[PDB]
Design a protein around this ligand. Sequence first.
Ligand SMILES: C[C@@H]1O[C@H]2CC(=O)O[C@@H]2C2=C1C(=O)c1c(O)cccc1C2=O
Lengths: 112, 112
Amino acid sequence: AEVNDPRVGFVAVVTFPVDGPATQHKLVELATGGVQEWIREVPGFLSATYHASTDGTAVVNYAQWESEQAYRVNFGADPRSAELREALSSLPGLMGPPKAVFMTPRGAILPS
Amino acid sequence: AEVNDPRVGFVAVVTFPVDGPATQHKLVELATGGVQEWIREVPGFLSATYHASTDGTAVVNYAQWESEQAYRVNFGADPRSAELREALSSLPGLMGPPKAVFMTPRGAILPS
Ligand SMILES: C[C@@H]1O[C@H]2CC(=O)O[C@@H]2C2=C1C(=O)c1c(O)cccc1C2=O
């Protein structure tokens, strides 16, 4: 969705500390892999965008949700998200556990 | 821009440490208050979205740029960015200097 789409009521920014670019690409490919296709139909899910920090030390997901309940229950209570957590957590190269910051969009500066 | 738009070549995630929600609100009102009206027309700028963290301790900007060069030239080497930063670090309740993470979008999951 557009960064300022008014449907976005809740964002999760999740950072995975990784040992380098190879693991960045390996973490990227695994979490956008095709097997994770059920997230696409999760109700209230708006988007998950994965990024590679420029210094090769991290993968950051900026995820857009309709609400905190959508993220917490619709996605989170589903057994497959537990499956997903372990998977990304067992990846060689991860240098620690992901760190998540939860937030609400409050204002946007866009071009006219 | 859409979060998954292929014109997004560079992202800056800027986290500002604040003393609570009333300062979260004042910093967002400050950042979308006319102080950076100039940024909107700059070549390469795609968006700056300011969010309040749910725990009350931070304001996070997810900023989209067409490329790093556009960011370095059009924003980093414009003296108005130092002016922006002086205005943002003049706010009471701002607990420390902003922390920035540079990165590139790699993969994305959009809704079904
Ligand atoms: C990286 C950067 O550093 C910050 C320090 C500050 O005080 O305001 C900053 C700041 C930074 C930035 O990248 C940035 C951007 O891409 C788009 C919009 C606004 C900012 C911004 O306000």
